[PDB]
């Protein structure tokens, strides 16, 4: 019935971490269909992405997915992660943040 809360909570924590001058990172489950990340960078089903302004271009924290351009090694890559695959958002410097709880819409 009601849409997922996750994307709203994601944007909220993203803003909160940046407003405290921290570096937001996402923990993503790379096994979900639709995940588009450089798999060489994934390990044991997950990958960590730096989404701070400094490390990304054209960042979109939409309700359906997180999208952005970033550099992996010496190569620019485009990333696309379905919200269902976003497990958590944490500050690289101190672990401040949250692990998202499951929701009906996400199967």
């Amino acid at each position: 019935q009601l849409t997922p809360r996750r994307p709203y909570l994601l944007r909220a924590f993203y803003e909160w971490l940046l407003d405290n001058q921290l570096t937001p990172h996402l923990v993503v489950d790379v096994t979900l269909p639709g995940v588009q990340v450089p798999m060489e960078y994934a390990r044991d089903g997950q990958i960590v992405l730096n989404i701070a302004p400094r490390a990304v271009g054209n960042l979109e924290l939409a309700n359906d997915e997180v999208r952005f351009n970033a550099r992996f090694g010496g190569i620019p890559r485009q990333v696309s992660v379905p919200l269902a695959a976003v497990l958590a958002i944490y500050a690289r410097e101190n672990g401040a943040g949250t692990m998202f709880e499951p929701e009906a819409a996400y199967d």
Binding site: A42, R43, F72, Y90
Partner: peptide
């Protein structure tokens, strides 16, 4: 800034 390699992100505080 470049994205973290596994050996870098596996060392972060949220593990």
């Amino acid at each position: 800034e470049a994205q973290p390699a596994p050996h870098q992100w596996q060392k972060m505080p949220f593990w």
